[PDB]
Design a protein around this ligand. Sequence first.
Ligand SMILES: [Fe+3]
Ligand SMILES: [Fe+3]
Ligand SMILES: [Fe+3]
Ligand SMILES: [Fe+3]
Lengths: 76, 413, 334, 336, 409, 74
Amino acid sequence: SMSTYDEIEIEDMTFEPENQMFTYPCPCGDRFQIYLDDMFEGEKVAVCPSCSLMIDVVFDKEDLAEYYEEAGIHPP
Amino acid sequence: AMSCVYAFGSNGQRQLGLGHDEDMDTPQRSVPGDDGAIVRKIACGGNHSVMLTNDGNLVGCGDNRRGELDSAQALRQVHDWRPVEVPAPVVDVACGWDTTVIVDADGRVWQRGGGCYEFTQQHVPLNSNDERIAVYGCFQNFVVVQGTRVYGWGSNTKCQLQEPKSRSLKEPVLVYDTGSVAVDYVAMGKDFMVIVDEGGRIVHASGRLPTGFELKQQQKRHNLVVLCMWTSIHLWNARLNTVESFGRGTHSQLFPQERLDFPIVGVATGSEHGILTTANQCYNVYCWGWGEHGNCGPQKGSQPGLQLVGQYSGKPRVFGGCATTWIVLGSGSGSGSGSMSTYDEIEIEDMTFEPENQMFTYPCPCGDRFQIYLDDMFEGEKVAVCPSCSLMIDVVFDKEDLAEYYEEAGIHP
Amino acid sequence: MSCVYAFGSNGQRQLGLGHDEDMDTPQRSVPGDDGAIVRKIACGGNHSVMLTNDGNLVGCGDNRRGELDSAQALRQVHDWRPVEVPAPVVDVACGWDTTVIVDADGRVWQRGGGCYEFTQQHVPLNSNDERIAVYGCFQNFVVVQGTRVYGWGSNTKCQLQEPKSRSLKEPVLVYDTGSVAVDYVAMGKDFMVIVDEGGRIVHASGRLPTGFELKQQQKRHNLVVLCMWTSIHLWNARLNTVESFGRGTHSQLFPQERLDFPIVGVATGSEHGILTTANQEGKSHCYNVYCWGWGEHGNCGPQKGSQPGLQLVGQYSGKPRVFGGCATTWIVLG
Amino acid sequence: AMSCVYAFGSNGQRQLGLGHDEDMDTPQRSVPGDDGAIVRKIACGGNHSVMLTNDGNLVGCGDNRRGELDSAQALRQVHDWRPVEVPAPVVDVACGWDTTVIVDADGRVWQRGGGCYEFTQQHVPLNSNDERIAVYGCFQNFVVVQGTRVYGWGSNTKCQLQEPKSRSLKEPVLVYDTGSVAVDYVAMGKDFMVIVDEGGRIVHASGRLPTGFELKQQQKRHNLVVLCMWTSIHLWNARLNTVESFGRGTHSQLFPQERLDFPIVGVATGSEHGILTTANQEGKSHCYNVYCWGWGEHGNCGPQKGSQPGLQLVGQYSGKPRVFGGCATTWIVLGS
Amino acid sequence: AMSCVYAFGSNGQRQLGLGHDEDMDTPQRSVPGDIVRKIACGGNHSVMLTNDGNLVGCGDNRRGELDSAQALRQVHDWRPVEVPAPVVDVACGWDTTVIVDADGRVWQRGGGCYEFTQQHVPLNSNDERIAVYGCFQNFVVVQGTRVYGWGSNTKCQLQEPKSRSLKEPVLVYDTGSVAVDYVAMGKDFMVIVDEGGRIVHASGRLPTGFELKQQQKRHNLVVLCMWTSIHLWNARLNTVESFGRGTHSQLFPQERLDFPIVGVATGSEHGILTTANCYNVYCWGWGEHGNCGPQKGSQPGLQLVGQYSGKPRVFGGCATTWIVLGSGSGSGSGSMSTYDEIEIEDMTFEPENQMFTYPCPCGDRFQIYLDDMFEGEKVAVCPSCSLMIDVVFDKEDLAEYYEEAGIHP
Amino acid sequence: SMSTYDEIEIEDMTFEPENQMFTYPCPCGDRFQIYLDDMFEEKVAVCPSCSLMIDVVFDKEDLAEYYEEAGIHP
Ligand SMILES: [Fe+3]
Ligand SMILES: [Fe+3]
Ligand SMILES: [Fe+3]
Ligand SMILES: [Fe+3]
């Protein structure tokens, strides 16, 4: 398993409907990122592209249906 | 006579004011404009840095993709130190992840960034007197403190402002009211808050407090200095000359519990790193915690202990940001060596009163005279300024001490 | 199961990620099994090989020299495809364009380097409980059984025997102790270092890098020897540090400062080092993985400037197995 | 024989004798009437400068709105170097904020300025001996030293003369008597005072002494040289080849504690800046380096006016220079 | 692949490339916009040469030292310098800039001319590399054995006798046997050193205490030069012998050094010492602009200005100090030089396209063309990384491969 | 009594026609400067932004060349 920097609730994550990606501020200035599709498969670890930090996304499968709907409503 | 600003650490969006976007591990001289500026206070966000000059002007640099700095929506990044447009001279300033909140001399709270590209006024119920208005902010929350009352707004997902949970609070609410002692400052972390009065006592705490922190146990203490990282609380204990840290220490954020050989004279924290200032055999500056971007020094391994990042003649003022470290020399504020602060304290009886123009004068080392008006002192002004240089002096007097000179001058007070 | 992560030079898709883009952060590399427990990962110049506990071998990367698949038409293995073996594999190593395996029957097979078929390397060995280990780097390979150390391949720097030779197709006796059993053989480009089970350097051959005085090093005990292409790295467990010897043009030389974190594992690629330490701050004891040396392909992390010092690439709950490669870094965790 | 006077710093009232009123960051030639006479001493006020030569002549330049220089009230400011009219040849001289005090060859003490445009004799109870009569002054206090006795007059708001507090003492009073070892000199600051004997020991201190300076402990030391800025005390320790400062040091008035590889041969201080004379012994020709430290935003410490800590080289000279300091003004006197 | 360039000292014209114009006393990372081989400094301008042959400069431009536009009085931050051809070597004067292209022709700008004026110098057309050196108001071009130079001549540093300047280059000195390694130049003097470490010829106003006839008899010496002083690096005695007035500590501390000297560089009136330890860099001499460190009193002794893991390359300018890690030089640690020395017998020859290949740690191969090697090139380059290796071979070793390929040389 | 950095011939100096002032390059990057009137009276040039000094070597003559180029004096 990974050693996470923090545990973040899915309602605290910044959802981006353009690409179905959840983002969260990283202490280095960048953002932890994790895709909706990966979360639907069972993955819960967000990853920062700039540093070595990682965080856990706390969610359930019954929480993901909301964000899939928001992704389809989002304009072209 | 400017301030020597040193900056190093994360520099992805040129938020170090160096012109380039290279991460630094050793203190680089950050010079705003050509000649520089007298920096009083530095506030840092996720990818942007804001400096408050001693004359109420803001100068910033870094990311502008959220409207943190410039109002031009087309401008994505402010490369070098550029003046931040303000509606009025700034008294205090704080920053969020992508936001900038200021407080003017008129007593109005303005906020920019986070999508908005214009300073939108925050309407907080405040009084109109000598009680100054200070602003503190971190991550997605800001706090305005006036004397006793503590107001705040922003995120409320961990009940760091009120109950129950809320995704955000646009309109400011009453976070806490002491009802007695004046609130000194508010140490803010990520989704948690700690309130400290002038007695050094923790009066109130809210939000998702880091593990190990027993609030009811800590409130029984006093003479404490509370520092905060995003996920940790750090209690400066001057009496035992140590720093007590709380929460997980996955990246050495927890202060080294080893006995220090020198007295602590100052403690500052960034996002996930701490800055320690101690005396010497003159002044040493150490960094600990997560620092794989150079904010802790050349060793970016986040190993435990304290990295000596610099040694200074006078006591420096340190500021912590998101993986960035700021060291300021000659802030113009304080009372230590090489601080460029107040020159001397003079009793009003030593001052030279001039009834011809209602003014008190006192000899200046340059050859001129510090000057101060009588009516201004009736309003509470206790500072005489030289007309040809930085120096200034504090005039010690009481309100009833002015009644003598009003009579000598022949003016009704 | 075993989760395999990889990053670095990916020009020939040797990371098993499917794409040819160089990475600077640990990427989830997934074969067609994953549920099985990884034993060892061996890397060549542009091809990677993963040995599992079930004896199955799987590889990916360049096949223009027959490194992986027998099909001469196939120039590159796209994803993690099973490497055809005559028998279950016990141990495996790789050369610049070669792959050598050691099966359960005790036979040593070699493919690649022009040969698209597994050709049995006839090395004189015994038939008992003494395990047969294989080691390899660049253009050389070494088979170790008990006390004997055999080897073949190149010999331009007299790494096998004397005098110089362009190649030695048939396995010759490199060295015999002949008392203490040989633990392993750390191999560089054109040199060789033999270590016993006592942590002592028993013998060294080939073009040894500058600064390394063999006579002075044989008087030392309890050492762990790692080898890059042009440098030797000594892991002194007692002093908790890594002693390095080489030109160090791109920061290959370990930062000779005493580490606070206890070193629990050391691995080396072609020109970069991989350090695993213990992080015992906080309630949970975790493990930090650092990288140093030439890593402009991102094999040392996001910082590709090849600056001196350790670079943190990740924290993990359990102690991971790290493996080196040609500008590639592998992290394996359960 | 000839003295070459160099001056720079605050020049708001043309007290640099340069003829103009521009602040200088580099040494400038200050040529008086007799630029061939040997300079004995240079005393500086707040805005007026006074130069004394061996021939007993006094010349001055700078402000005169308080009567520091000339008896003519309509002379607001003395443009260039002008002969200061004296009742007798001057042997020693000292300046206050807006006052000038002299000691003549007859042994009398005269004071002008601070309102009075006339040289008024200060009647200090002296003895009819051959003992030299020295005068020292700063801000609003003057001191006359003869033998072992130290007399003084002026301000007394901080009890720098006697007890208790007085707004002013017009008549000279006995500040201190040793009364064995002869007093070498008296280092004066703003509303405070330090007395030193010929043994290099601090015999007595009075007035608002700056923080960190504990008189009781400093009296147990020998072979010292005491300098005084307005709000700081400085101790030249030749044994350790360094200067020990005592003050808040808001503008780098505190001498750099680092090791000096050059031997110190002379130390002087202005209002809020120090002047260091060192011996450059590197090479065949031994020359002298002059450094400045402390508050120098008027260019009185050199080209760099940021008042940054550390010594700032302002010039190098063949022979040993004699340095003098005033209110943000630096004087360098030579000889050729 | 990136060189870390540190810079501090006089910054009155932004020649440090830091953006601001404040003088620095501590090494600041100078970053060219968003691999450096050599740094040349002038009076108030700086020139930085890269491995790919490009020049990037910053500083004063009131004499045309950098940009051709006359309206540009000063170059803010690092900006590219327009060159007619890839530069191999670059030197600087008080207000000038002289370059040497791969074509083997010398250009000069600055000092009044806002355009690169070609300096016609009688040179050959072979493997002999063309090096250039310059200081104050004089420049010297050395292709090997022969030494040409132009500029001022008020102190007879070019010929005899006088006067002012010489626009047309003249033959300063010819050995004519042993090749000239370098030419150390001062303000109004000049010292020529061969590859034997022997002073061959010296012209101009030599500083006091320096007798030429006494020094010519010596060998294995490294000659460095300030404006008014000559400094000899005696590696055998591990010290630096200085010759001059030394009014501001220019004379190297003749005290016993604890660690072996590994590098000596000089500015206008200050020296930069590099010793072992991992690597310490010291600065002595006149440095009241912070160019010698925080202590700007020009006191005698060595000021520690920093410590480095790998052996750094150093350059000195007019009251400025440059420290570059991971340059494009040779040998040393952390210098990012040539990766490894490989014999031609260990190379892989490809007769199809006349090319020699050798494995690279990145996974690719170092390549080098046969035709290039016949002209005297010995460095193989990897398509995909900073790497470079040196191929050891002789001219008579190429005949075997020309026969295998079937091509006449 | 000026301890100088170097002695420079008046012919080697640089003359700015309008200012009646000779300049010479300085190791700090600036330039030493001396006035012609002071030379008829001083042989020392001073750098504005440093602390070095140089001597301008000349006799009690050979200054008419620059006097005539100035268009005025003596
Ligand atoms: Fe990050
Ligand atoms: Fe003033
Ligand atoms: Fe490569
Ligand atoms: Fe200069």
